[PDB]
Amino acid sequence: AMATGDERFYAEHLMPTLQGLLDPESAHRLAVRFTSLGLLPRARFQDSDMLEVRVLGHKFRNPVGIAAGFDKHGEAVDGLYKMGFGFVEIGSVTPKPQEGNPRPRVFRLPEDQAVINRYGFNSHGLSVVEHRLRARQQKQAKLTEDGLPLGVNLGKNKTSVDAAEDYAEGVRVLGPLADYLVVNVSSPNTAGLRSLQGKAELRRLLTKVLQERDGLRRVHRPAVLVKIAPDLTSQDKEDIASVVKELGIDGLIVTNTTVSRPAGLQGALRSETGGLSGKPLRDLSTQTIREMYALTQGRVPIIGVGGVSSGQDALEKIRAGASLVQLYTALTFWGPPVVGKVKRELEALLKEQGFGGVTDAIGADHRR
């Protein structure tokens, strides 16, 4: 097809050539700019009814989203929908602006189809992002009604003395502009942050977040999800599941990047500090989805993320318990045509495996 034409040219020629000329962070910035301007190949893929999912109080035209980190500051939302994503997540956004870690802080591992990053929550801050989303608020209301929801991922400032207050501020400022919020407690690149996944600290934090969310007017009241690491102990996972059910958290995003370094990585930069993403994370993420689905009795929507680059990858996460999936790292290797690729392959596999649509496949492995 013309679809598989672009896919091949991008993956085999354009992307490796451009990536060889650019610093990884320059590549990131350039990608956000081009996306923001809508300077994109044609997304010829027409979303099928088979791909629609109803979860988190919304219709999703397709189950493939852009993960947090690509558009940290909400600059490229419309362009990301033009790429064919069924939903967009922006952030992480911190309350105050902050620079993040010194450069270089992003590393390519092409032999592993992986990235390592240590951005450290570089953010324009809540006020900037609020004004950016306000400028297109009604455009987004129509997008959401048309099955293209918006998520906002909230972080905390490096120097904050009260983490829960940083998240509360995010709920109050960006909650009214979001379909869902994410309490990101799983960056590997902010000191002490992942300790907020622990039981006592998590219950107190999430209680505060949910109280702030519940105080928003109805049409401005988002779902609240918790994004977790792939590096949790069994105890940590059980505790999260317990808290989520007790408080009525609306969903989970599973997973962030890993601080592990799986045996077999080949890239020269494998021992850089930071979170590892892409292919080496894939199965660690899938198995975290599987465990969290079981621990929550299939009653808590999961957005599955980590190492998705194909329809098989997406379907493995769906069958393990994800209602929706995200990707980021694949885009850095394949470019924009990867979105249509994943969707096309996923549709084909659903038909081959006897599923009437995505919904029927959610958690299917648990019923074998």
Ligand SMILES: CCn1c(CO)nn(-c2cc3c(cc2F)C(=O)[C@@H](c2ccccc2C)CN3C(C)C)c1=O
């Ligand atoms: C992890 C940081 N990081 C890295 C380095 O690790 N790369 N990277 C991306 C670069 C990208 C893209 C997507 C990316 F995620 C595109 O989709 C590319 C693109 C092609 C044609 C038209 C329109 C677009 C937007 C352009 N490129 C580069 C060649 C500039 C990115 O965020």
Ligand SMILES: Cc1cc2nc3c(=O)[nH]c(=O)nc-3n(C[C@H](O)[C@H](O)[C@H](O)COP(=O)(O)O)c2cc1C
């Ligand atoms: C450069 C980079 C920056 C990221 N920044 C964030 C972030 O600000 N917030 C967050 O929740 N996740 C962040 N992530 C994690 C992704 O959202 C995702 O959970 C992870 O990369 C696994 O998906 P992937 O293998 O498809 O990239 C970032 C990932 C990368 C590669």
Ligand SMILES: CCCCCCCCCCCC[N+](C)(C)[O-]
């Ligand atoms: C930073 C990426 C550089 C490559 C950009 C490729 C943009 C191609 C999309 C332009 C729109 C398509 N058109 C009308 C020319 O066929």
Ligand SMILES: O=C(O)c1cc(=O)[nH]c(=O)[nH]1
């Ligand atoms: O800003 C970052 O360093 C970052 C945040 C996050 O949640 N995950 C990640 O891999 N990087």
Ligand SMILES: [Cl-]
């Ligand atoms: Cl508002």
Ligand SMILES: [Cl-]
């Ligand atoms: Cl590390």
